[PDB]
Amino acid sequence: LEQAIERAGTKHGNKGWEAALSAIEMANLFKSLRGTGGSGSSMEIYEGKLTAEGLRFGIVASRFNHALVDRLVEGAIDSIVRHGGREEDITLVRVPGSWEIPVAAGELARKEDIDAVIAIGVLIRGCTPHFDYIASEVSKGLANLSLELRKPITFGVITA
Amino acid sequence: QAIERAGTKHGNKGWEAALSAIEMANLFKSLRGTGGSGSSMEIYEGKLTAEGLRFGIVASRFNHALVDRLVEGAIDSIVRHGGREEDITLVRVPGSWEIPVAAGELARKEDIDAVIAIGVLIRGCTPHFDYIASEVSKGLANLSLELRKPITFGVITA
Amino acid sequence: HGNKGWEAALSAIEMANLFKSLRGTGGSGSSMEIYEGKLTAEGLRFGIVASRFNHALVDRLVEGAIDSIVRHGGREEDITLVRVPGSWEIPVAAGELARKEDIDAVIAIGVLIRGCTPHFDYIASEVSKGLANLSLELRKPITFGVITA
Amino acid sequence: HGNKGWEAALSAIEMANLFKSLRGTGGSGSSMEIYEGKLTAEGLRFGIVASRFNHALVDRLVEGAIDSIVRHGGREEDITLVRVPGSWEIPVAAGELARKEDIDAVIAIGVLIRGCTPHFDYIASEVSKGLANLSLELRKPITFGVITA
Amino acid sequence: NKGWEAALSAIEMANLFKSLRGTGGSGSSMEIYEGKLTAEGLRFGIVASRFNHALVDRLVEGAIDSIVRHGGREEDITLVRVPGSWEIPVAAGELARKEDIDAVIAIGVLIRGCTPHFDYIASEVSKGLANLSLELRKPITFGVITA
Amino acid sequence: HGNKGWEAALSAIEMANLFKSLRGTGGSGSSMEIYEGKLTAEGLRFGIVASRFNHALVDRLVEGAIDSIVRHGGREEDITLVRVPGSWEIPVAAGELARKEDIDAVIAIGVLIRGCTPHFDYIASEVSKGLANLSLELRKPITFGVITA
Amino acid sequence: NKGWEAALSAIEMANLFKSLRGTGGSGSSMEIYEGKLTAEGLRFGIVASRFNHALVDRLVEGAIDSIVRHGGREEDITLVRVPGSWEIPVAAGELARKEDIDAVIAIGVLIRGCTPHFDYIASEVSKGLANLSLELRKPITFGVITA
Structure with a gap:
């Protein structure tokens, strides 16, 4: 019964939908x-x-708050398959935290088979009037890699 | 000419109607x-x-400025989603009153999978019941259940 | 050239x-x-259904409608005029004209009764509903030239 | 239990x-x-039709509907669920679902616009009229679980 | 009308x-x-977003209008549409590297205002266009607005 | 055939x-x-004055106006088109065209600025007033095709 | 910057x-x-008010700047300052009747906004410039702002 209630809901409005879209x-x-x-x-x-x-993708997801990270990645995969894609061309990589997202995405983006990279994660705190160091550094690598490797990288994290 | 096509046609009611x-x-x-x-x-x-899907779109010629934006939005929603413009037919009617009758003829054809209704309804300045907007709404709903095919309601009120 | 009978004929x-x-x-x-x-x-055959209330106003609408048919290359011989006593039973008279293979299009002209504006009336709500159901089942166009005084 | 989805399925x-x-x-x-x-x-096979508009509230209504059916001795295997993008075409999909010989009852779930209409709404009436007409013609029960926001 | 100023x-x-x-x-x-x-005799290139379609279309409208009014020709104008406000720098990099384009114009609309704290999304688009202009030695006008 | 430029040309x-x-x-x-x-x-000579605000909408009105002139037997050679930067100074441009003996009729096309509806604006109140005073003194007809967005 | 638009x-x-x-x-x-x-080869003329000196000087600054940037020469520019917002139409009439001036630009700042009822002062300045342009057959740009 528990395996059926989780698939009852729809994954259309989550942040991972438009990120993969x-x-x-x-x-x-x-x-x-x-x-x-x-x-x-x-x-x-x-x-x-x-x-x-005919498109090969790549998804990188963090490990913190797996109750929420798994929600976004499931809605991310549903975007490709419902738009004519195939599950055979999807690569999923998991990282312990948000600090390791830019380095992990660099390896996938250098492969000739991968056409796009999608990054999914959850930020810590965020709602503060102070500069965040762990939050700012993850945006540096994704922006720099895209302008260097000529490959799109989507920023689709959420703050709670 | 290039000025008109510069504007975007994403998010208008013609986009969701074709979607x-x-x-x-x-x-x-x-x-x-x-x-x-x-x-x-x-x-x-x-x-x-x-x-591999064939579509048909009916549009009212009244309020030519607003209709052209909605019609082009529905056409672009098919090509950008993998459809082919050779499988799309377009018919025009003098007003919104002639949309249910024209949409029925397109649905009778075997090689039509969906029908898109696009039009502009004149909004009454004073709040009163409209005897024209009600007939077009009920006309399309009855045809969909009878003919076992889906017809999308995509008109707007000015 | 500006009355509601001109637009309905076109x-x-x-x-x-x-x-x-x-x-x-x-x-x-x-x-x-x-x-x-x-x-x-x-080469087109037309049928015209007109009411009788406000006989002064209906005559202008009927005259305006027949003028538009012949001005656009239509033969005067190929039109049929039927007079109707009340605006309530226009649909039953219009259905008989549209049920024959001779008539191609049916034009309905009438004047509604204006009573209390903000409420709902039943005489006007049935003449329009009956005409709409006739067109979808007979596969023929039926215009709606009925105006309100 | 406290939601309308619980009552609709019952x-x-x-x-x-x-x-x-x-x-x-x-x-x-x-x-x-x-x-x-x-x-x-x-031994009862039921079908569920739900709309994707305002999925924040629809997921709670379908939660109660699927919780009560398993509580009252209904097995999960024989439940068919169909999603539609908008509430306008709810009975269009329900027509094909109810026509199957292997189905017994059809439950429709949806959320409409706010109810402060001036005199009438051209969308809320069509979904209710279509389901009532469909049930009488097919002689099969249809439950109206749509709740106005 | 920041679209007219950016194109000028x-x-x-x-x-x-x-x-x-x-x-x-x-x-x-x-x-x-x-x-x-x-x-x-100048060939340009315009990159526009697809967020707040009402506001963007007004800014894009003045971009082409500014060029043609100042003697430019509509034949030598290239227009690219992007999904969001994040992808302009990577999209403009491919367009600016063509040898038939002399200037690149970026049009977009931000989400938040200026009263909250530092916005990570707003900084990346500004930093990306600045580095591209110096690296490619080609002007790239920055003319987005803030909601 | 239904835009405001068609009616102004007629x-x-x-x-x-x-x-x-x-x-x-x-x-x-x-x-x-x-x-x-x-x-x-x-045998008629016409002059057209058009603004520049909302360049997408003005082009349809200008194209609709020139089509009506040639459709009704008017020579395409006998029309003069003048573009105007702003809607405020349309009257001064229209007066120059109507002050010569060659031009018989002057058509003004523009789009007004919509700000606060219930109050009074001065840009729109002067373009109409200036055009009216020009016709009475020059003894020539000047149409008013200016619309509001 | 309505001064740039009026001069343009x-x-x-x-x-x-x-x-x-x-x-x-x-x-x-x-x-x-x-x-x-x-x-x-064009000679212009600018009329400016002296109310809200901070706002007027910004608008006047763009008026001369627009002319020189578009190939105009500062030698052929005449500038007249007026006491208030009421006297522009009579001041512009004497300036526009000179045969060495091809265009007249009016700059000013109003007092009230647009939410109150009809303003008698705001109507006279707009009506005066409109009649002068038709009577003298010379363009007079109307580029004042509303506070």
Whole structure:
């Protein structure tokens, strides 16, 4: 009975839904940017499709507060499969804490098979009028890696 | 010309109207299929794919400024979701009163999986019952149950 | 050229032309199909249903409707006029005209009774509901030219 | 127990028990015939339809509906659940679910807009009218568990 | 209308870089470099977000309008739409590295205001565009707004 | 065919025809004289003044206006288009076009700024007042196609 | 900065009137008149108030800055200061009648807002400038603000 009540709820509105959704329309956008150019006679507009067929992804999740981390990752995987993706092209890596997220995502982003990287985690405290050191450093690596490896990385953590 | 297409068409009522037809047209295909093995709860949910599906959109010509934004939003919701623009047919009606009759003819065709209703309803400045907005709402609902196909209600009130 | 009978006549003309396109052969592809009716009334057969309350106002609406049919290339011989005593039983008279294969479009003209505005009336709520149910089952367009004084 | 989902599922349980009693032959007599429904769900196959709009509140309603059915002797295996994006097309999906010969009762769960309408709402009436008409035509019970926000 | 101001700044930066890339003066006087407000023969690029669609469309509308009014041609304008406010720096990096683009304009809308504490999301987009301009030696106008 | 630019163009056409009737020779009597303008645009010279705010919406109104001129028999060569930066100074641009003997009718198209509805604004109150004073003194018709967003 | 916008509008009105005053086209196509954004060889005139000196000086600062940045010359700019918000229309009438001035810019600051009823002072300044432009056939930009 417990195995059925957990799947009764829907995972559409969680933060992991749009975090994975943004990566689907970003992998297809880079394909068109580096492809052939336009034919002229009009303004060129580039946008990404929502077809997740033939795309290899990667998900990194923390370990703190597994009652909430597991909620987001389940909703993250549901985005790809419901959009035409396959579970055969999903790689999941778990890290002890949020400090190790940027280093773990660097290894996956350097592989030629991976097309996008999704990072999921939970921040500590946050609701304070003081500078946070562990919270600021995790945003440094993700932004720097994306601009260096030319690969999208999605920031989809939540603060409680 | 490029000025008009620069604006976005995401989030308007035409986007959700076409989005619901994507799930409904795929949910029905799973229902007619073989049932599950058992020993667990069976949950049906339609995927957001749009490849190999044919759609039809009916639009009212009244209030041409607002309708064109909604019509283009529904068209872009199909192509960006994997659909093909060769499988989309479009019909126009003089007003919102002629939408249920036109939507019925498109649904009678075998090669149509969903029907999108797009229109603008004139909002009464004084609060009173409308004898036109009620007929179009009940007309589409009765056709959906009778013809075993889903029709999406995607009109707005000015 | 500005009365409500002009607009109702125009809607019945292009809707009849649009219905023949769907029943005809489809396109060859390679493009997105778009259907729209023209304003040619040649070869079309029309039927007009008019009430009798406010006889002064109805005559203008009926005269305005017949003028639009012949102005857009429609033959005067191919129209049928039926007078109706009360606005309540317009749907039953309109159904008989639309049940024959000769008539292609049916136009309903009438004037409603204005009583208490903020409440709900039953005479006006049934003439519109009956006309809507007739079009969906007979597969024919029926315009709604009924106005309120 | 305190939510409306608990009450909605309970009504569909004993109503299904009432319908199977009418199929059997009548008694010999000597007393007036009274028919009652029991709270036993053994051998009953039920279907649930829920809307995804405002999923914060819908998950609580479906929590009570799925908790009461297992409490009253109903096994989890024979429960079918279908999700819809909006409450507008609740009876469209329920029409196909109720038409199956392996189903007994259909329970619909949804949340509508606030109820301070001026005179009428064009969405809340369609969902209620569709389910009532569907139940009479198919002769199968349908429970209206939709709660206005 | 910050869209008009952001597009105006990028117009006179391309001419300034063209003058620096060109040959110098003949001497005998002070050397002064200036940026004209003529967009003749210039190809630009616009990156826009998809949050608060009402506000963004107003800012994007003035971006193209500023170029064409100042003599620019609509044929040489490239427009890219991005999902959120986080992805502009990585999206602009691929666009700015093309040899047929002389200026890049970034349009977006932030979520929070300025009264709360330090915002991590708002800092990354500003830091990413600053590093790209210095590394690629190409101007990138920063013209987002704060809600 | 339904935008506000279509109606403004039609008004400027028949008003120009009506003005020539008054300047011509009068009737012979024996009846009540009635004057009305036709919808023939041949031999007429028109001038169009358009603003620049909401460039997406203005283009449709300008395109709708020029279509009505050529559809009713008007020569495309005999129209003059003048673009105006702001809606406040439309009257001064319109006066220059109407002060020459070549132009017969002047069409003004613009979009007003919507701020606080129940109060009084001065930008919109002067564009309409200036246009009205120009027509009475120049003896030429000037339409008012300015809409509000 | 409404001072920049008011000066920008007056720049492209002088060219529009010069094209209309000039000879027409050769035909065989639609005749379209446009206003360029080049202030070469144009003489302007600015009228400013002396109420809320902090706000007015900011608006006046952008007025001269807009002209010089768009190719205009500071030599051909005339500036007049007026006591209050009431005297601009009569002051601008004497300035606009000179044959060496092609455009007039009015800068001022109102007292009240827009929530109270009809303001008699605010209406007279707007009505005076509108009548002068039509009577003298010379553009007069209206660019005041409301406190």
